[PDB]
Design a protein around this ligand. Structure first.
Ligand SMILES: CN[C@@H](Cc1c[nH]c2ccccc12)C(=O)O
Ligand SMILES: CC(C)=CCSP(=O)(O)OP(=O)(O)O
Length: 346
């Protein structure tokens, strides 16, 4: 059973996650495991009344819910379900938030027998005494069949101040053995996130995010070099095309030798391009359909999250991403908001 009520943050999010597990076709056992894993990872936030304001005005989601869901669609397969959580969200300040987040990661490492050595290597870079914003630690859980999830940790290159973003990112990549990766990164307006895979890997795997305030379809195609035409068509499809849009690229480095990324993702914040979620869902559905992906599952996933009409707001479909990975089929990922605190109006 569950100690959480539907008036509590944990009750709402576990209900949403359980329904999403059905869309992902996870069995009852795995579903129970992951609903409990989410509740535990939220800590005291799980029991917080939804009537109180969000403890932290987090960047994780627009309405400051410390959870966001995503579904990764591959051609002809049921989508894979992931959840992003901020374990330290119910804390008073950023330093306490980060401490609680690291504690959560350590508990996961103990439970699932993986090492935090690579993460520990970076602690002084990303968790200083008086950290800067906008966040401290997020955790992405890939909810795989079997009940043992994939785990990634997200860290803030601006933790030691905005002026040290590049210095911090470059020193982290160096410590991790990725001494040529920075040179592979496109021009950017921010380095909002560094992600580290945690698990059974003898060498670090990292993902570097770049914010582009005014990215063009042509530039997106350029940066996808690890392909160009699929990335440009995706840009137009999701952007609905003015000539430039705000977007993020992710650059995944899975070996330390070449300095070349093995993965590239274009993340399009569709919620910023459309009037309401009816339009955002339309564009995501069209992209999935064109790629031969499970577009019916998208509709079921949205309904699993909220029963509201899609046109009654915007931001439920937070992002659509095109994921390229050497040696794999392209993937489309749709990011879906919890809306535990607010529905942004059209
Ligand atoms: C309000 N959400 C933040 C962080 C974020 C959540 N999910 C993402 C997916 C892709 C890129 C970023 C994000 C933002 O929009 O930047
Ligand atoms: C959750 C955030 C902050 C960004 C998108 S998650 P991602 O690009 O790493 O997706 P994958 O783990 O590579 O499938």
């Amino acid at each position: 059973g569950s100690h959480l009520e539907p008036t509590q943050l944990g009750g709402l999010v576990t209900d949403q996650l359980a329904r999403l597990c059905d869309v992902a076709r996870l069995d009852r056992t795995d579903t129970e495991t992951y609903v409990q894993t989410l509740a535990t990872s939220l800590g005291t936030a799980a029991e917080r009344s939804l009537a109180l304001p969000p403890t932290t005005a987090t960047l994780l989601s627009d309405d400051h819910t410390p959870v966001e869901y995503s579904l990764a669609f591959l051609p002809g397969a049921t989508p894979a379900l992931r959840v992003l959580v901020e374990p330290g969200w119910d804390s008073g300040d950023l330093a306490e938030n980060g401490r609680a987040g690291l504690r959560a990661i350590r508990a996961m490492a103990d439970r699932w027998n993986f090492s935090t050595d690579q993460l520990d290597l970076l602690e002084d870079l990303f968790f200083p005494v008086a950290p800067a914003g906008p966040f401290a630690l997020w955790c992405a859980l890939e909810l795989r069949p079997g009940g043992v999830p994939g785990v990634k940790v997200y860290l803030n290159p601006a933790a030691r101040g905005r002026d040290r973003r590049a210095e911090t990112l470059r020193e982290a990549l160096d410590r991790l053995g990725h001494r040529q990766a920075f040179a592979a990164l496109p021009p950017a307006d921010d380095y909002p996130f560094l992600a580290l895979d945690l698990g059974e890997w003898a060498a670090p795997r990292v993902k570097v995010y770049c914010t582009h305030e005014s990215l063009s379809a042509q530039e997106a195609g350029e940066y996808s070099r690890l392909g160009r035409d699929q990335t440009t068509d995706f840009f137009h499809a999701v952007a609905g095309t003015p000539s430039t849009r705000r977007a993020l690229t992710c650059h995944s480095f899975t070996d330390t030798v070449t300095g070349r990324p093995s993965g590239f993702t274009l993340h399009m914040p569709v919620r910023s391009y459309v009037e309401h979620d009816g339009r955002a869902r339309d564009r995501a559905a069209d992209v999935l359909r064109r790629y031969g992906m499970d577009n019916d599952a998208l509709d079921r996933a949205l309904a699993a999250v909220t029963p509201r009409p899609l046109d009654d707001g915007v931001g439920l479909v937070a992002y659509v991403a095109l994921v390229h990975q050497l040696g794999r089929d392209p993937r489309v990922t749709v990011y879906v908001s919890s809306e535990a605190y607010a529905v942004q109006p059209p």
